[PDB]
Amino acid sequence: MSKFYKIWMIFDPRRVFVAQGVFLFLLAVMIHLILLSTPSYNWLEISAAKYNRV
Amino acid sequence: MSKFYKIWMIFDPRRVFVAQGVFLFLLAVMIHLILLSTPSYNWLEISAAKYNRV
Amino acid sequence: MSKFYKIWMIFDPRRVFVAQGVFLFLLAVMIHLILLSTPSYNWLEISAAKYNRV
Amino acid sequence: MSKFYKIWMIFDPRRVFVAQGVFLFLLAVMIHLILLSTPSYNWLEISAAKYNRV
Amino acid sequence: MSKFYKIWMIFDPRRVFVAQGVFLFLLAVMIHLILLSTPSYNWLE
Amino acid sequence: MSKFYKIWMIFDPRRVFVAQGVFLFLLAVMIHLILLSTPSYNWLEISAAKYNRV
Amino acid sequence: TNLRLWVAFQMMKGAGWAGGVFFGTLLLIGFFRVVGRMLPIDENPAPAPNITG
Amino acid sequence: DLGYTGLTDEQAQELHSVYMSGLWLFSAVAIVAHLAVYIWRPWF
Amino acid sequence: LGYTGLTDEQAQELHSVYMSGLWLFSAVAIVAHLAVYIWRPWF
Amino acid sequence: SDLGYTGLTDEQAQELHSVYMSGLWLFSAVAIVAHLAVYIWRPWF
Amino acid sequence: LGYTGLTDEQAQELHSVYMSGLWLFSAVAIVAHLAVYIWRPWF
Amino acid sequence: ALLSFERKYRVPGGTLVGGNLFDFWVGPFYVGFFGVATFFFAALGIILIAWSAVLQGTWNPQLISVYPPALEYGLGGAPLAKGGLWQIITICATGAFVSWALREVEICRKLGIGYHIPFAFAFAILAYLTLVLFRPVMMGAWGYAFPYGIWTHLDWVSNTGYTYGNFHYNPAHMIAITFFFTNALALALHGALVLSAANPEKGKEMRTPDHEDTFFRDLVGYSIGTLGIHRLGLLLSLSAVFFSALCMIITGTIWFDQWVDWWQWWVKLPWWANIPGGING
Amino acid sequence: AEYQNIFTQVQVRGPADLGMTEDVNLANRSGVGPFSTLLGWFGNAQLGPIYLGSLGVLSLFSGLMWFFTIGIWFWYQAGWNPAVFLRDLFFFSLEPPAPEYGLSFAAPLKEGGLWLIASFFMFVAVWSWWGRTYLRAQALGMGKHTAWAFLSAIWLWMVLGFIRPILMGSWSEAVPYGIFSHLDWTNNFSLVHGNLFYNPFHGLSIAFLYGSALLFAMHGATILAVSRFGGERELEQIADRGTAAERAALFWRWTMGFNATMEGIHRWAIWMAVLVTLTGGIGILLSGTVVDNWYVWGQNHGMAPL
Amino acid sequence: MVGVTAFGNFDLASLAIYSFWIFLAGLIYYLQTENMREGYPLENEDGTPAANQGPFPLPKPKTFILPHGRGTLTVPGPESEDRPIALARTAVSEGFPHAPTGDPMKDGVGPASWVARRDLPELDGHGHNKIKPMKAAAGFYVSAGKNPIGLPVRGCDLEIAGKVVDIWVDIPEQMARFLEVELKDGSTRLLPMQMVKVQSNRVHVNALSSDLFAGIPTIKSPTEVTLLEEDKICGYVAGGLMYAAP
Ligand code: BCL
Ligand SMILES: CC[C@H]1c2cc3[nH]c4c(c3C)C(=O)[C@H](C(=O)OC)c4c3nc(cc4[nH]c(cc(n2)[C@@H]1C)c(C(C)=O)c4C)[C@@H](C)[C@@H]3CCC(=O)OC/C=C(\C)CCC[C@H](C)CCC[C@H](C)CCCC(C)C
Ligand SMILES: COC(C)(C)C/C=C/C(C)=C/C=C/C(C)=C/C=C/C(C)=C/C=C/C=C(C)/C=C/C=C(\C)CC/C=C(\C)CCC=C(C)C
Ligand SMILES: COC(C)(C)C/C=C/C(C)=C/C=C/C(C)=C/C=C/C(C)=C/C=C/C=C(C)/C=C/C=C(\C)CC/C=C(\C)CCC=C(C)C
Ligand SMILES: COC(C)(C)C/C=C/C(C)=C/C=C/C(C)=C/C=C/C(C)=C/C=C/C=C(C)/C=C/C=C(\C)CC/C=C(\C)CCC=C(C)C
Ligand SMILES: COC(C)(C)C/C=C/C(C)=C/C=C/C(C)=C/C=C/C(C)=C/C=C/C=C(C)/C=C/C=C(\C)CC/C=C(\C)CCC=C(C)C
Ligand SMILES: COC(C)(C)C/C=C/C(C)=C/C=C/C(C)=C/C=C/C(C)=C/C=C\C=C(C)\C=C\C=C(/C)CC/C=C(\C)CCC=C(C)C
Ligand SMILES: CCCCCCCCCCCCO[C@@H]1O[C@H](CO)[C@@H](O[C@H]2O[C@H](CO)[C@@H](O)[C@H](O)[C@H]2O)[C@H](O)[C@H]1O
Ligand SMILES: CCCCCCCCCCCCO[C@@H]1O[C@H](CO)[C@@H](O[C@H]2O[C@H](CO)[C@@H](O)[C@H](O)[C@H]2O)[C@H](O)[C@H]1O
Ligand SMILES: CCCCCCCCCCCC[N+](C)(C)[O-]
């Protein structure tokens, strides 16, 4: 752990950051769309079914 | 955290802004589309329901 | 906020203006088409029903 | 707008006037076709029905 | 308004007129086909 | 295991870690999906049934 | 009055090609139209491939 | 001035004068044609 | 500045003619819209 | 080179930006009136 | 390291303008979210 | 924004129409006389497809379809909502393709190269014109052309194919399918062979076209050569499309029944039609 | 008239090219065969020599047994009549065992037993040829792109005949050995799984079969267009870029707005062709195992009205 | 396992179709950046680097070793059109043509362009010359087709410009490369075979007219042609279709 900083002497920083940035975005979109496809956690329809919107 | 300014010494400013502007617009378009899909947040037909335009 | 003019020291105005004109016109068409898509806001059908021209 | 004339110190008139010519004719045919498709504003059939030609 | 003649100092007259003949004929063909399609103005019948 | 450290003389650290990074994520995602597929271990359907969210 | 005839011939040259190409296609359409009516079609009318719309 | 295509200032005026005269005369024939159709079968 | 080579006095003369054609174009369209709104209003 | 990729100097960018925002404010002002007219005609809220 | 070519003070200035616009964009979105939440809350 | 070697190639000339009226580049694209035509036709057809979507009532791109006019309209015009929009988009697509092919000819002249590319693109155009224009004109109605939808133009293919049974039995179909499979096989071999020569094993000298001939002689005993493989690749694809358009210009105009029954002319040849045994005897 | 460089107007012939011996076992390589004038009008005229080593013997003899096994079954199916064999050649078929046996090997030789024997010969012949394709490149110190591109086509071949029938639990799912027979199998495979057109990977697989046809027509026409500048020798254009590569790139730069290099276009070519069978293998492997109706699955995934 | 979905309608077929979109996006990034190894970075209309370089970053250098001790080529690297481009821009703005400042064919611009390549012959795997005249190559003969030796060479102006002396052949490929044509001046020029049309009684060159053969670039050795000479000869002849057919 004390010597984790060596990771940036193995890999290009420019390629790591783009690789991680795309990964983090797609993962968050995947999890958000997983909850939207579950009616138990679809925050849009939960409010609709709670405030009697329909 | 103060040294976040040094991301500009790593990434070319030109490609970042083109990538970011596309990302923001496509994201904003996507979120506006998800609301339009739900009948409970489709602000166009909420007004039709409210003002009896059908 | 008072130093936004330096965007022109990064992007060429000729390519920025061309992209902006394409983007704004396509966005204008997309929003106008979306309204015609909805029955509640189709200004052609609204006047047809209002003035009894069906 | 007292200095909008500077746009011609950015864009060559030969390429602008050609581009604007295609846009204005594309926009004109686009709208004249939109009215023809809608039965409310199809002036070719409004005359046909008005004079009992069918 | 009185200076529209300077359009011929920008574009080539010998090439504009050739293209303008193409545009005016294709526009004419377009309208006749639309008229020919409508039952009321179909004159070939 | 005293001389395990000489594995790196044989393989590039760059090629190993990318291969390990892709492998671990694909294994992890697959197992999470296998659990969601089974109704007995879908932690989102369990919670809905526990809290009467359907 | 050479310039008046010059501009007219430049435009008539443009419109001649548009007409020549256009009426060239009508012959091609007219060709398949004639070959269509000399074949046993209209006695074996195929069904509609797509819903009428 | 600009001389993008290489025509003098007094050359463009003479060419435009000929071009515009044909344009109006062409529109006169078109209005006659449109007026004939409107009498026969008006579209308004 | 000056990507096309036209000077200030040339840009203003170029823009003077362009806006004249623009106001001419819009004036015809304004009348055309007024006539159509008389014949069949869309509001 | 953040000191200018496009060859514009500092003062030229300021001049170009002032003209650009003037068009932006004019274009947005038309849209504000257009939305104000549509909202009075047929509000979406 | 520095792969682009920007000196340290240029990175300071480029970030200062970028973050100034970053707050402006997020400021408008905060007001939009606060306005939409009052009109029709999603919680 | 030019390639490092592009300055000496941007010269005025080689324009079929105009010469300086539309002789310039917008970015990397060459705006010819037909570049203006291609853009107008490409742009109008796209927005009509967008407009046809609002008439259809959908925004899912995979559900948007523009249908041809119904079979009751024959070969004439149609209302815009029914099939008139299809006829405009078909005209717009036909104009855009021919302008794109004609615009490529101006680029060939300005670079001084052969006209193989525009000629090969016209084969695609002729196959397309066969399906929407030539074949429907023969059959008699515009309703036999395929619709302009991502998944509904597949329904036209499936429905048209099963009108004649299994379409695999069309003899010109079998020839065309053979050319398509050979073209993709040769493309894999051609890309792999050149890449292996340019990228040898490791720390090795770049190989030579003498290694390219030797590899395929060791493998399959023959090598068509570096010039032969490019002639073959062009001819396999042009042949694949030629027999593609051939198999559909004869379907429903000359052949009307099941394509399986065609192959009974061979199995009923007089000298072996009555020999007992086998599958058909 | 103008020369389009589609046929060689003049042929020149010299000593027979025996190839280069980088690491090749020169014993296994045969002698140069004949010269074809007819093939010389289009490409090279020289036939051979061919390398037939250890994997060549295994592949050619196994491929012979696969071919000869199907032939003898066709002679049996013809009643040993040379005329009937000729008549019904496209109708004969060697079929896999009936679905009652599942994956078991206890089916009679006339009811899917010879199919298993012929299939084993094909399994050995095709896979040995991939090894030969790999080893022939290695002896010349060349890259393995041919071997790995071939592995993409073997993938669809193994999905059709081996992998999917194992996953479906019966050899009856596999492809019969015949001309009209395997066309019926293809037609019936779609009907059983509900309009295979709506399989997303069949749709993608077709996108790359048309893309390969599009790409080779483009690339083949481009090279013949710039062949006047010595453009056919793509290998020496990569080492020292010439006016052929610059005109070829600038054509597609001015046309499409983007272009390729002389070497990078062959990465498009190899990747476009391998996706034809790489994607096709997944779509075939997903049919019946995961989806048993592609039109109904499509309806739930856009792609089709409800 | 038909109908098994982890969530919503996301079954194993959805995982496959969505995994391919990600793989295809990565492949298109790779295929495009591997095609930025020549002609980059982008220049302005005068020579300076452009302010726009595109969404795709440049790839990392790769070294090509050359098969006969000809050196190491690393791409992408420093680039320069090592020659005097003789062009003057027709407009101050960008995107407009460049007019030649003189004779275009001699100056080497437009469709008559050439690239300054390595000024050495191309070598086969044995190290010999890939192209050499047929009378120097041993055992090479005209196996089929009209032997185009001794036929007059007619230009695009339907006037005779010489007669064919020899054929330059590609030794390993075994195909004809050039026709060596002797002029009335007594000298010899090379004409690429792709640019000639060998008829029954003559060779017709549609590109050049009669009074341009004397302007074809010559070769420094009677039995050896280099890549620089090939590019000048091929570029000059094919440039006559535009600048030499008036
Ligand atoms: C009615 C029938 C269905 C249909 C049913 C199927 C089925 C079933 C399949 C396809 C498959 C495909 N379909 Mg389909 N398909 C339909 C409609 C179409 C249409 C169209 C215009 O309508 C087109 C263009 C296609 C095209 C395609 C291809 C994209 C794909 C085949 C790839 C391939 O090359 O495999 C051919 C290549 C191989 C099989 C690999 C062979 C390599 C082996 C290893 C070599 C062995 C050599 C052998 C031993 C011989 C040796 C000889 C000596 C060496 C000389 N289909 C309709 C809807 N289609 C295939 C696929 O994978 O798609 C998902 C497939 O399985
Ligand atoms: C003939 C051999 C093969 C071939 C060759 C070929 N194609 C070519 C060329 C060549 C030589 C080009 O030079 C040209 C090119 O520049 O390619 C990059 C091209 C081209 N082939 C293309 C596509 C293409 N080729 C196909 C096939 C083939 N092309 C053959 C198999 C297919 C198939 C099988 O589906 C497609 C989709 C383009 C990438 C390009 C031509 C681009 C073009 O025409 O540009 C101008 C037009 C537009 C920008 C779009 C206009 C849109 C319309 C106005 C509206 C939509 C109409 C359309 C019919 C709707 C379809 C709906 C549904 C069916 C999806
Ligand atoms: C389907 O499967 C489900 C979803 C159900 C479950 C699966 C779950 C899985 C597989 C989860 C996996 C999760 C993982 C691996 C998460 C990893 C997250 C990580 C590693 C996040 C890291 C984030 C790092 C960030 C955000 C760092 C940002 C850094 C900056 C913003 C500063 C930029 C750096 C600079 C400026 C350095 C400059 C310095 C110099 C000297 C130039
Ligand atoms: C599907 O979801 C929907 C669409 C419903 C909702 C989503 C909506 C979204 C994502 C909307 C996004 C909207 C955005 C980002 C809009 C942005 C609009 C902008 C930036 C408009 C700006 C316009 C500015 C203009 C038109 C300025 C023009 C300026 C001029 C004409 C001045 C000319 C400039 C000169 C002459 C330069 C000076 C030159 C010299 C030499 C000094
Ligand atoms: C689906 O959505 C629908 C289509 C229903 C609604 C959407 C509507 C949309 C998006 C509409 C967009 C409309 C726009 C942006 C319209 C803009 C129109 C403009 C800017 C028109 C401008 C016209 C200007 C003209 C015609 C100017 C002509 C100028 C001349 C003839 C001057 C000639 C120039 C000369 C002689 C050069 C002088 C040279 C010297 C040296 C003095
Ligand atoms: C599909 O959508 C529809 C069609 C339904 C609606 C769309 C309509 C649209 C967008 C229409 C667009 C119309 C436009 C822009 C029309 C513009 C027409 C113009 C500018 C016509 C100009 C013509 C000028 C001409 C013909 C000038 C000719 C001049 C000469 C030939 C000079 C010499 C001739 C003389 C002096 C006349 C006497 C000479 C002889 C030899 C008798
Ligand atoms: C007069 O003619 C003579 C007798 C001299 C020779 C004539 C021969 C003839 C007429 C040959 C005809 C051959 C034909 C028509 C061949 C057609 C072959 C076709 C269409 C094949 C198509 C697909 C085949 C596939 C996909 C086979 C796949 C097989 C595998 C992937 C491996 C199979 C291995 C299995 C199933 C398990 C084997 C393992 C054990 C332990 C038995
Ligand atoms: C390029 C490929 C696509 C090309 C598309 C071309 C479409 C444009 C067609 C133009 C020609 C139209 O041709 C015309 O069509 C109309 C359509 O009502 C037909 O009109 C016919 O049907 C109408 C239906 O109410 C009746 O009045 C009557 O039966 C008859 O007039 C005419 O018989 C025909 O002459
Ligand atoms: C572009 C490449 C990157 C893609 C995005 C990165 C994440 C990849 C995995 C995304 C998985 C989620 O994808 C999402 O899945 C749910 C699961 O039913 C789908 O399903 C949802 O909509 C469909 C269609 O209206 C309904 O039939 C269904 O009832 C509903 O649950 C969504 O239509 C899809 O958008
Ligand atoms: C004011 C009347 C104008 C009449 C001329 C209109 C253009 C005529 C073009 C003739 C073309 C004839 N053709 C057969 C070549 O198409």
Ligand SMILES: [Fe+3]
């Ligand atoms: Fe190639």
